[PDB]
Amino acid sequence: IAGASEQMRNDLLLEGFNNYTFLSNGHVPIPAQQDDEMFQETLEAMTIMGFTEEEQTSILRVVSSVLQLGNIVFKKERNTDQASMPDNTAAQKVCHLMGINVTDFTRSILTPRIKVGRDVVQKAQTKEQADFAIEALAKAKFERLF
Amino acid sequence: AQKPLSDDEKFLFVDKNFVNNPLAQADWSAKKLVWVPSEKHGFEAASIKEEKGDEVTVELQENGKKVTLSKDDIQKMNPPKFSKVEDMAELTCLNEASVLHNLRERYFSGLIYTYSGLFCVVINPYKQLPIYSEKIIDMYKGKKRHEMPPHIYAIADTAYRSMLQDREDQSILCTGESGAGKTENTKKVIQYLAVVASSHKGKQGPSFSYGELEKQLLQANPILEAFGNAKTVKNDNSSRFGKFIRINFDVTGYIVGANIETYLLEKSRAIRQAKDERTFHIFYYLIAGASEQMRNDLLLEGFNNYTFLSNGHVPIPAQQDDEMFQETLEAMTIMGFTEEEQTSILRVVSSVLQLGNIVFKKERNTDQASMPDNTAAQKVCHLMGINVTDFTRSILTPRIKVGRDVVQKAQTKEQADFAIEALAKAKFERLFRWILTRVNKALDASFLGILDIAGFEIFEINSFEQLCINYTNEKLQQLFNHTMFILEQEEYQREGIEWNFIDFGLDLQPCIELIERPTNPPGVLALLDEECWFPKATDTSFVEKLIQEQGNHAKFQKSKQLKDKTEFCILHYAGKVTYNASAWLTKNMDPLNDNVTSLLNQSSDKFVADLWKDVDRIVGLFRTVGQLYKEQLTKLMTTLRNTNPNFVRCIIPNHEKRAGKLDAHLVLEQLRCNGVLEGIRICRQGFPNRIVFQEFRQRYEILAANAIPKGFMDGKQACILMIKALELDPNLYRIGQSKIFFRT
């Protein structure tokens, strides 16, 4: 978010500090290290290890889709109770750095065409069921990344 | 002004090449032009002359007769441009008068199938319209709907396409009364996939090389027509059976699994033929083509010297049982029965003569009835791949087990000669379904389900066989309603999207209750499940309990005084029928004995282990035929609920079997019955599809590289950028809370 150059600031899809809900305590500063330049540094360090000409921006994207997932807010639509999701950049900026299927991310995240027994079972998810699962997805992508 | 349209292809494309007349634009001066009620035309054309509060002296512009009529009778006149249209939902004026009108002038031009918003209307022509071959595969192949006019191969691709796209598991269900056209709009789909969805060892009219599994795929029908059809009062040779398919697909989408199911049979007459009726084809044939030697060997008692070849030998018009012996001996060979199997199907004459004899003849003294013949059971269970002793044991004594109590007891005649008529004729049924096993065996992420309904009928002597026929119809019909009225608009409240609620009065559940509703005041089936489990209960007291419980219901009707025959006339969605109740009680019972079902579940031989692994429903404490067939139709109906109901809604023009003959009021009856005008009235209004806004942003950024420039905002508004940069219309989509509701 800090050492973004204007091209990949709009490519790797950067809004400013606190436009991510999953970054709490706002932006806490660190003593005697300034995240701003520390970005630029680590990018060099990549090129020294031999992280590829494109690959550097790819690691940075996976990160930023994780940064992104927490705009996916579920409001209690209270006439199923099985409530769904208003914004799309919440998922969009996530799934352009994912490139999974855009249709099917949310259509999974709302209707699990899942499995009870050993066959295909449909259900709409509740507000509650939808939040918790997407949350797991947000974090789990950073683990897969590491 | 376009090209000349082919004589044939007029039956695909509308005759557009007509005349630029000024009359259709001058005539509007008569500004009180209206559609008015008519028994013969359905509606017609008139004009208001004088406003009497809620009356108006309306005047016909056909007959010229002044008819004072009310503000509410008079229905809005449509513009001439809408004649014979491709989608019915396009008619600016929706109102019954004119939603009726689109079909009449259409079918007579050739134009059978027509889109009606969500569902598509498919009338019967009774004429060999040439609309099939690989011309019509590859014309329509892989095809986005707008490039191919309203005809079947569009539903068929849309199944295979969508499944790999939206990835709903897709299904196909064909509806509408008898003759209508359903059987055949099922088989044509098997032709489609065998070429299109399959795979190929490398790689016109009828010709192409399909693969191996795909070749086996076809060769089933001709046998069951003898060993199953029997001489009635209405038809000396009528069939009585009806079917289904599932089509499992791999990772890449190819045909891998395929699963055919048939539903129920006129399984009853063998041990009760009415005066001047006959039994199942083959009996009469074995006595007739009886060479002396096998007259001794195959155990032939003679003409009339039979328990239940009633009315002696009744002959048959224009058929001679003699010779017919050989023809019906021939058919069994094709899809493949051996000569062990056929000396056995020779003793399947002895087994349909003795499935006129595996019936626990009501035991007058004890009441719980028992097995007349060992040899008959011996014929039977070996030819059902289980064991003969283990069968009959259970078929008298269910050796079940609740708590401590090994619920060991006798079954009654009704209970035992039901689980052994429910297995003399689930011999005749799960052995019809053994022909179905002998197919599926070579036949079995995604799947396609398809359903050939036995089609709504009226015999004179209708009976449980027909109770079910005009039940499947009715049961599928409340599926349609719940999917397409109620649940829809519930979600319309939900999303925050502008749409106000309309009710349609299309819960047809009241006729379906009138048959199927277990609790509350029960209907036909429920009263008969209870009555099936009942000693004080006579087919008589079944109809007495039906008058008792239903009576005054605005969909029910008594017999034409024939309490003596004990029968009931009912309004089903497509009007009225008489059923007759003699020997119905048993025909609702099938108490699927798990003792047998489990020996069948764990059966050894090439016959059974496959078709009884459906162990779920079975009596672990439970079900009847009525119930079983509500449930078999629920294994269907509630997984259908959780699939996409592509409906192929077949419509009858006449009851006179004729070429040409339409009746617009018979059709208008079947429109109210099929729930058409209101199925169109929802799907004109809302938005059939429903998905979120990301299906916008990704798949098309490529389409308009400039659209989102430096900087980004909300997903809705950002997609709205490329949306307006591709002109996407503010009511084509409905960018809701979650979902873009998408129209047709």
Tab-separated table of N, CA and C in Angstrom, chain B residues 326-452:
chain	number	residue	atom	x	y	z
B	326	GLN	N	-44.886	-67.161	-32.153
B	326	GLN	CA	-43.541	-67.218	-32.679
B	326	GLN	C	-42.871	-65.858	-32.702
B	327	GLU	N	-43.625	-64.871	-33.197
B	327	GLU	CA	-43.172	-63.487	-33.241
B	327	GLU	C	-42.709	-62.982	-31.883
B	328	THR	N	-43.534	-63.230	-30.862
B	328	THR	CA	-43.164	-62.759	-29.540
B	328	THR	C	-42.136	-63.671	-28.878
B	329	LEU	N	-41.965	-64.918	-29.334
B	329	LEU	CA	-40.776	-65.673	-28.961
B	329	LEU	C	-39.504	-65.073	-29.551
B	330	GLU	N	-39.577	-64.506	-30.757
B	330	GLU	CA	-38.391	-63.954	-31.396
B	330	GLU	C	-37.750	-62.731	-30.741
B	331	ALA	N	-38.508	-61.715	-30.317
B	331	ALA	CA	-37.949	-60.445	-29.830
B	331	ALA	C	-36.871	-60.400	-28.730
B	332	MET	N	-36.931	-61.337	-27.772
B	332	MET	CA	-36.069	-61.370	-26.595
B	332	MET	C	-34.574	-61.479	-26.856
B	333	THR	N	-34.234	-62.065	-27.996
B	333	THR	CA	-32.866	-62.242	-28.443
B	333	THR	C	-32.029	-60.981	-28.668
B	334	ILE	N	-32.620	-59.850	-29.080
B	334	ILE	CA	-31.866	-58.721	-29.618
B	334	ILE	C	-30.915	-58.066	-28.615
B	335	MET	N	-31.443	-57.396	-27.580
B	335	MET	CA	-30.587	-56.875	-26.519
B	335	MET	C	-29.964	-57.947	-25.636
B	336	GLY	N	-30.492	-59.171	-25.701
B	336	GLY	CA	-29.696	-60.345	-25.374
B	336	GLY	C	-30.195	-61.225	-24.241
B	337	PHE	N	-31.121	-62.155	-24.488
B	337	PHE	CA	-31.425	-63.185	-23.496
B	337	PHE	C	-31.042	-64.571	-24.007
B	338	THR	N	-30.290	-65.395	-23.273
B	338	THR	CA	-29.837	-66.705	-23.751
B	338	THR	C	-30.965	-67.752	-23.823
B	339	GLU	N	-30.696	-68.986	-24.264
B	339	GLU	CA	-31.704	-70.044	-24.266
B	339	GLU	C	-31.968	-70.707	-22.918
B	340	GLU	N	-31.054	-70.596	-21.948
B	340	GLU	CA	-31.366	-70.970	-20.572
B	340	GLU	C	-32.452	-70.031	-20.045
B	341	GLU	N	-32.154	-68.747	-20.253
B	341	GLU	CA	-33.061	-67.644	-20.001
B	341	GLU	C	-34.349	-67.797	-20.777
B	342	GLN	N	-34.322	-68.297	-22.013
B	342	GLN	CA	-35.548	-68.529	-22.758
B	342	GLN	C	-36.286	-69.841	-22.542
B	343	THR	N	-35.692	-70.955	-22.104
B	343	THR	CA	-36.482	-72.070	-21.587
B	343	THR	C	-37.110	-71.663	-20.258
B	344	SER	N	-36.392	-70.755	-19.596
B	344	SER	CA	-36.927	-69.993	-18.497
B	344	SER	C	-37.987	-69.002	-18.932
B	345	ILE	N	-37.943	-68.276	-20.062
B	345	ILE	CA	-39.040	-67.412	-20.502
B	345	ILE	C	-40.205	-68.175	-21.140
B	346	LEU	N	-39.946	-69.414	-21.571
B	346	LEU	CA	-40.999	-70.400	-21.766
B	346	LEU	C	-41.645	-70.749	-20.432
B	347	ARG	N	-40.888	-71.032	-19.366
B	347	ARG	CA	-41.491	-71.115	-18.044
B	347	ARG	C	-41.687	-69.774	-17.330
B	348	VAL	N	-41.484	-68.680	-18.070
B	348	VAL	CA	-42.093	-67.389	-17.783
B	348	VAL	C	-43.445	-67.276	-18.486
B	349	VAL	N	-43.873	-68.209	-19.349
B	349	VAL	CA	-45.298	-68.308	-19.649
B	349	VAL	C	-45.933	-69.013	-18.450
B	350	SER	N	-45.397	-70.177	-18.064
B	350	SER	CA	-45.662	-70.798	-16.773
B	350	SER	C	-45.398	-69.833	-15.605
B	351	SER	N	-44.503	-68.837	-15.679
B	351	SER	CA	-44.419	-67.788	-14.661
B	351	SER	C	-45.295	-66.569	-14.892
B	352	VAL	N	-46.114	-66.423	-15.934
B	352	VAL	CA	-47.069	-65.318	-15.945
B	352	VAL	C	-48.476	-65.899	-15.870
B	353	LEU	N	-48.684	-67.108	-16.398
B	353	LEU	CA	-49.683	-68.031	-15.875
B	353	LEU	C	-49.489	-68.285	-14.385
B	354	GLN	N	-48.294	-68.622	-13.877
B	354	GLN	CA	-48.105	-68.666	-12.431
B	354	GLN	C	-47.653	-67.373	-11.757
B	355	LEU	N	-47.715	-66.220	-12.425
B	355	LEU	CA	-47.913	-64.962	-11.708
B	355	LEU	C	-49.363	-64.495	-11.871
B	356	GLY	N	-50.158	-65.288	-12.577
B	356	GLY	CA	-51.563	-65.417	-12.245
B	356	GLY	C	-51.739	-66.397	-11.089
B	357	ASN	N	-50.711	-67.170	-10.720
B	357	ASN	CA	-50.789	-68.080	-9.585
B	357	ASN	C	-49.877	-67.773	-8.399
B	358	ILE	N	-48.793	-66.990	-8.452
B	358	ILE	CA	-48.152	-66.520	-7.232
B	358	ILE	C	-49.022	-65.349	-6.829
B	359	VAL	N	-50.118	-65.682	-6.158
B	359	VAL	CA	-50.995	-64.745	-5.509
B	359	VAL	C	-51.526	-65.515	-4.319
B	360	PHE	N	-51.364	-64.959	-3.122
B	360	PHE	CA	-51.872	-65.580	-1.911
B	360	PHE	C	-53.380	-65.388	-1.872
B	361	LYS	N	-53.989	-66.342	-2.588
B	361	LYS	CA	-55.425	-66.456	-2.742
B	361	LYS	C	-55.993	-66.337	-1.347
B	362	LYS	N	-56.848	-65.308	-1.220
B	362	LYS	CA	-57.411	-64.897	0.052
B	362	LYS	C	-57.863	-66.115	0.821
B	363	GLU	N	-57.167	-66.295	1.945
B	363	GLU	CA	-57.368	-67.466	2.767
B	363	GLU	C	-58.565	-67.245	3.678
B	364	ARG	N	-59.697	-67.713	3.149
B	364	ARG	CA	-61.007	-67.635	3.795
B	364	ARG	C	-61.160	-67.944	5.288
B	365	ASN	N	-60.185	-68.560	5.966
B	365	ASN	CA	-60.454	-69.198	7.252
B	365	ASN	C	-59.620	-68.569	8.350
B	366	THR	N	-58.352	-68.356	7.995
B	366	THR	CA	-57.402	-67.690	8.860
B	366	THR	C	-57.263	-66.211	8.531
B	367	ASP	N	-57.400	-65.851	7.232
B	367	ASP	CA	-57.377	-64.495	6.653
B	367	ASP	C	-56.013	-63.988	6.138
B	368	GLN	N	-54.975	-64.388	6.882
B	368	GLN	CA	-53.596	-64.161	6.466
B	368	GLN	C	-53.263	-65.200	5.405
B	369	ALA	N	-53.097	-64.820	4.134
B	369	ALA	CA	-53.091	-65.851	3.091
B	369	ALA	C	-51.718	-66.407	2.745
B	370	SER	N	-51.628	-67.527	2.006
B	370	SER	CA	-50.360	-68.184	1.704
B	370	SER	C	-50.175	-68.720	0.271
B	371	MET	N	-48.894	-69.016	-0.004
B	371	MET	CA	-48.312	-69.442	-1.274
B	371	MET	C	-48.811	-70.756	-1.877
B	372	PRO	N	-49.607	-70.724	-2.956
B	372	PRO	CA	-50.149	-71.906	-3.617
B	372	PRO	C	-49.116	-72.859	-4.210
B	373	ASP	N	-48.088	-72.309	-4.870
B	373	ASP	CA	-47.138	-73.139	-5.592
B	373	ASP	C	-45.659	-72.786	-5.439
B	374	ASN	N	-44.980	-73.837	-4.968
B	374	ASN	CA	-43.530	-73.874	-4.826
B	374	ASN	C	-42.788	-73.725	-6.138
B	375	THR	N	-43.193	-74.482	-7.168
B	375	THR	CA	-42.547	-74.450	-8.479
B	375	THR	C	-42.571	-73.048	-9.049
B	376	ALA	N	-43.668	-72.331	-8.785
B	376	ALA	CA	-43.835	-70.957	-9.222
B	376	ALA	C	-42.856	-70.004	-8.550
B	377	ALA	N	-42.694	-70.104	-7.227
B	377	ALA	CA	-41.691	-69.333	-6.496
B	377	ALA	C	-40.285	-69.701	-6.964
B	378	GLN	N	-40.108	-71.007	-7.207
B	378	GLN	CA	-38.886	-71.620	-7.734
B	378	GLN	C	-38.483	-71.054	-9.094
B	379	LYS	N	-39.462	-70.903	-9.994
B	379	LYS	CA	-39.277	-70.228	-11.273
B	379	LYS	C	-38.810	-68.789	-11.009
B	380	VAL	N	-39.573	-68.126	-10.142
B	380	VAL	CA	-39.438	-66.711	-9.866
B	380	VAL	C	-38.149	-66.222	-9.215
B	381	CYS	N	-37.750	-66.652	-8.017
B	381	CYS	CA	-36.618	-66.078	-7.296
B	381	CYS	C	-35.257	-66.418	-7.889
B	382	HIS	N	-35.147	-67.575	-8.562
B	382	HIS	CA	-33.952	-67.924	-9.324
B	382	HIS	C	-33.821	-66.947	-10.480
B	383	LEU	N	-34.942	-66.659	-11.147
B	383	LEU	CA	-35.004	-65.597	-12.132
B	383	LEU	C	-35.245	-64.219	-11.508
B	384	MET	N	-34.796	-64.031	-10.266
B	384	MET	CA	-34.575	-62.711	-9.707
B	384	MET	C	-33.297	-62.730	-8.867
B	385	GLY	N	-32.504	-63.802	-8.975
B	385	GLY	CA	-31.104	-63.753	-8.572
B	385	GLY	C	-30.868	-63.804	-7.072
B	386	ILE	N	-31.918	-64.235	-6.368
B	386	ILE	CA	-31.921	-64.327	-4.916
B	386	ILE	C	-32.144	-65.795	-4.547
B	387	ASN	N	-32.824	-66.147	-3.451
B	387	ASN	CA	-33.140	-67.542	-3.157
B	387	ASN	C	-34.631	-67.785	-2.909
B	388	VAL	N	-35.077	-68.991	-3.270
B	388	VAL	CA	-36.501	-69.313	-3.362
B	388	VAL	C	-37.180	-69.553	-2.013
B	389	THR	N	-36.439	-70.175	-1.094
B	389	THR	CA	-36.906	-70.394	0.266
B	389	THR	C	-36.870	-69.130	1.110
B	390	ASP	N	-35.727	-68.445	1.007
B	390	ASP	CA	-35.515	-67.186	1.697
B	390	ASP	C	-36.535	-66.112	1.340
B	391	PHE	N	-36.877	-66.057	0.045
B	391	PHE	CA	-38.048	-65.334	-0.428
B	391	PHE	C	-39.331	-65.666	0.346
B	392	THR	N	-39.888	-66.878	0.167
B	392	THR	CA	-41.250	-67.223	0.584
B	392	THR	C	-41.499	-67.162	2.080
B	393	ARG	N	-40.464	-67.597	2.809
B	393	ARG	CA	-40.332	-67.333	4.242
B	393	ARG	C	-40.689	-65.885	4.582
B	394	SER	N	-39.971	-64.950	3.956
B	394	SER	CA	-40.143	-63.544	4.266
B	394	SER	C	-41.498	-63.053	3.775
B	395	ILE	N	-41.866	-63.543	2.586
B	395	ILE	CA	-43.116	-63.255	1.930
B	395	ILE	C	-44.370	-63.783	2.637
B	396	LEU	N	-44.187	-64.602	3.674
B	396	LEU	CA	-45.217	-64.936	4.646
B	396	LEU	C	-44.960	-64.320	6.017
B	397	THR	N	-43.792	-64.673	6.541
B	397	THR	CA	-43.319	-64.121	7.782
B	397	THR	C	-42.196	-63.115	7.559
B	398	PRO	N	-42.471	-61.810	7.695
B	398	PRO	CA	-41.445	-60.792	7.862
B	398	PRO	C	-40.757	-61.098	9.183
B	399	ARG	N	-39.455	-61.321	9.064
B	399	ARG	CA	-38.679	-61.647	10.234
B	399	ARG	C	-37.997	-60.324	10.528
B	400	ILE	N	-38.784	-59.330	10.952
B	400	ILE	CA	-38.220	-58.039	11.292
B	400	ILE	C	-37.949	-57.959	12.787
B	401	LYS	N	-37.644	-56.787	13.350
B	401	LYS	CA	-36.934	-56.708	14.619
B	401	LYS	C	-36.979	-55.272	15.123
B	402	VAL	N	-37.894	-55.013	16.047
B	402	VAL	CA	-37.984	-53.712	16.687
B	402	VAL	C	-37.664	-54.026	18.137
B	403	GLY	N	-36.748	-53.296	18.779
B	403	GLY	CA	-36.398	-53.516	20.183
B	403	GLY	C	-35.801	-54.894	20.454
B	404	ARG	N	-36.396	-55.599	21.425
B	404	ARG	CA	-36.151	-57.025	21.656
B	404	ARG	C	-36.888	-57.793	20.568
B	405	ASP	N	-38.123	-57.346	20.383
B	405	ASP	CA	-39.132	-58.087	19.676
B	405	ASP	C	-38.812	-58.195	18.204
B	406	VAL	N	-38.233	-59.367	17.943
B	406	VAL	CA	-38.096	-59.857	16.583
B	406	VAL	C	-39.530	-59.966	16.086
B	407	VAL	N	-39.937	-58.917	15.364
B	407	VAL	CA	-41.280	-58.799	14.831
B	407	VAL	C	-41.359	-59.792	13.685
B	408	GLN	N	-41.632	-60.979	14.200
B	408	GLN	CA	-41.873	-62.192	13.466
B	408	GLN	C	-43.377	-62.283	13.581
B	409	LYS	N	-44.051	-62.389	12.443
B	409	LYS	CA	-45.495	-62.520	12.398
B	409	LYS	C	-45.885	-62.914	10.986
B	410	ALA	N	-47.159	-63.266	10.826
B	410	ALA	CA	-47.713	-63.422	9.498
B	410	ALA	C	-48.089	-62.062	8.931
B	411	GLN	N	-47.975	-61.938	7.617
B	411	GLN	CA	-48.635	-60.852	6.915
B	411	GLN	C	-50.032	-61.322	6.500
B	412	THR	N	-51.024	-60.412	6.372
B	412	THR	CA	-52.385	-60.743	5.907
B	412	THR	C	-52.418	-61.166	4.442
B	413	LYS	N	-53.516	-61.491	3.734
B	413	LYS	CA	-53.448	-61.568	2.276
B	413	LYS	C	-53.023	-60.228	1.681
B	414	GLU	N	-53.678	-59.190	2.179
B	414	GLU	CA	-53.473	-57.831	1.722
B	414	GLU	C	-52.015	-57.447	1.970
B	415	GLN	N	-51.456	-57.764	3.135
B	415	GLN	CA	-50.063	-57.474	3.407
B	415	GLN	C	-49.178	-58.441	2.637
B	416	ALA	N	-49.388	-59.751	2.719
B	416	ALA	CA	-48.474	-60.733	2.158
B	416	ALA	C	-48.682	-60.919	0.672
B	417	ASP	N	-49.903	-61.189	0.199
B	417	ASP	CA	-50.195	-61.075	-1.221
B	417	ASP	C	-50.225	-59.607	-1.567
B	418	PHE	N	-50.056	-58.567	-0.745
B	418	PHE	CA	-49.399	-57.426	-1.364
B	418	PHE	C	-47.910	-57.540	-1.435
B	419	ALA	N	-46.983	-57.544	-0.475
B	419	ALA	CA	-45.561	-57.780	-0.761
B	419	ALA	C	-45.180	-58.967	-1.665
B	420	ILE	N	-46.165	-59.829	-1.997
B	420	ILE	CA	-46.096	-60.805	-3.072
B	420	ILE	C	-47.149	-60.622	-4.179
B	421	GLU	N	-48.131	-59.706	-4.134
B	421	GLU	CA	-48.420	-59.066	-5.401
B	421	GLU	C	-47.446	-57.930	-5.656
B	422	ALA	N	-47.210	-56.900	-4.852
B	422	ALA	CA	-45.972	-56.108	-4.852
B	422	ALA	C	-44.634	-56.824	-5.034
B	423	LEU	N	-44.605	-58.161	-5.059
B	423	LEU	CA	-43.558	-58.920	-5.731
B	423	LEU	C	-44.020	-60.076	-6.622
B	424	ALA	N	-45.296	-60.242	-7.003
B	424	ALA	CA	-45.661	-60.996	-8.211
B	424	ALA	C	-45.618	-60.055	-9.403
B	425	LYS	N	-45.801	-58.783	-9.074
B	425	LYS	CA	-45.900	-57.698	-10.014
B	425	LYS	C	-44.993	-56.548	-9.622
B	426	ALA	N	-44.195	-56.616	-8.555
B	426	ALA	CA	-42.801	-56.236	-8.732
B	426	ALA	C	-41.904	-57.392	-9.167
B	427	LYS	N	-42.451	-58.596	-9.360
B	427	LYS	CA	-41.838	-59.480	-10.337
B	427	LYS	C	-42.192	-58.850	-11.672
B	428	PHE	N	-43.456	-58.789	-12.079
B	428	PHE	CA	-43.837	-58.005	-13.250
B	428	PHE	C	-43.347	-56.551	-13.277
B	429	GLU	N	-43.095	-55.812	-12.183
B	429	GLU	CA	-42.385	-54.541	-12.231
B	429	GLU	C	-40.894	-54.584	-12.040
B	430	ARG	N	-40.233	-55.049	-10.971
B	430	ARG	CA	-38.782	-54.994	-10.900
B	430	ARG	C	-38.177	-56.064	-11.808
B	431	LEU	N	-38.972	-57.001	-12.353
B	431	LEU	CA	-38.551	-57.752	-13.538
B	431	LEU	C	-38.887	-57.047	-14.856
B	432	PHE	N	-39.874	-56.151	-15.023
B	432	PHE	CA	-39.800	-55.193	-16.139
B	432	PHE	C	-38.535	-54.342	-16.015
B	433	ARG	N	-38.347	-53.819	-14.814
B	433	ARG	CA	-37.097	-53.221	-14.392
B	433	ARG	C	-35.889	-54.167	-14.386
B	434	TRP	N	-36.009	-55.501	-14.510
B	434	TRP	CA	-34.897	-56.352	-14.917
B	434	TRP	C	-34.562	-56.185	-16.395
B	435	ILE	N	-35.508	-55.881	-17.284
B	435	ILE	CA	-35.143	-55.488	-18.645
B	435	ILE	C	-34.369	-54.168	-18.545
B	436	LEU	N	-34.899	-53.246	-17.739
B	436	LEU	CA	-34.206	-52.010	-17.385
B	436	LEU	C	-32.823	-52.203	-16.738
B	437	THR	N	-32.637	-53.272	-15.952
B	437	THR	CA	-31.314	-53.630	-15.458
B	437	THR	C	-30.411	-54.091	-16.593
B	438	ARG	N	-30.927	-54.931	-17.498
B	438	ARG	CA	-30.132	-55.487	-18.579
B	438	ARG	C	-29.663	-54.449	-19.592
B	439	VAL	N	-30.261	-53.250	-19.547
B	439	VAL	CA	-29.760	-52.068	-20.238
B	439	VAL	C	-28.718	-51.309	-19.402
B	440	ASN	N	-29.136	-50.653	-18.299
B	440	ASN	CA	-28.286	-49.881	-17.387
B	440	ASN	C	-26.924	-50.436	-17.034
B	441	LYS	N	-26.854	-51.762	-16.938
B	441	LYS	CA	-25.620	-52.530	-16.791
B	441	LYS	C	-24.495	-52.137	-17.749
B	442	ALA	N	-24.821	-51.836	-19.010
B	442	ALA	CA	-23.830	-51.390	-19.985
B	442	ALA	C	-23.835	-49.871	-20.181
B	443	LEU	N	-24.566	-49.198	-19.288
B	443	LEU	CA	-24.941	-47.804	-19.441
B	443	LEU	C	-24.382	-46.871	-18.362
B	444	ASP	N	-24.408	-47.278	-17.091
B	444	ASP	CA	-23.430	-46.791	-16.126
B	444	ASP	C	-22.249	-47.743	-15.974
B	445	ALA	N	-18.189	-35.376	-13.147
B	445	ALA	CA	-18.793	-34.633	-12.055
B	445	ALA	C	-20.259	-34.227	-12.175
B	446	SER	N	-20.809	-34.309	-13.385
B	446	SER	CA	-22.036	-33.619	-13.741
B	446	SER	C	-23.014	-34.649	-14.302
B	447	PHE	N	-24.317	-34.373	-14.364
B	447	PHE	CA	-25.283	-35.379	-14.772
B	447	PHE	C	-26.487	-34.774	-15.458
B	448	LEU	N	-27.165	-35.484	-16.371
B	448	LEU	CA	-28.366	-34.953	-17.000
B	448	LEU	C	-29.543	-35.891	-16.774
B	449	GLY	N	-30.632	-35.391	-16.185
B	449	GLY	CA	-31.796	-36.215	-15.864
B	449	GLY	C	-32.959	-35.925	-16.806
B	450	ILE	N	-33.706	-36.911	-17.336
B	450	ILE	CA	-34.686	-36.681	-18.402
B	450	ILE	C	-35.922	-37.523	-18.087
B	451	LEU	N	-37.189	-37.150	-18.332
B	451	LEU	CA	-38.300	-37.975	-17.834
B	451	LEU	C	-39.523	-38.256	-18.715
B	452	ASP	N	-39.729	-39.449	-19.310
B	452	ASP	CA	-40.884	-39.673	-20.173
B	452	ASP	C	-42.095	-40.111	-19.371
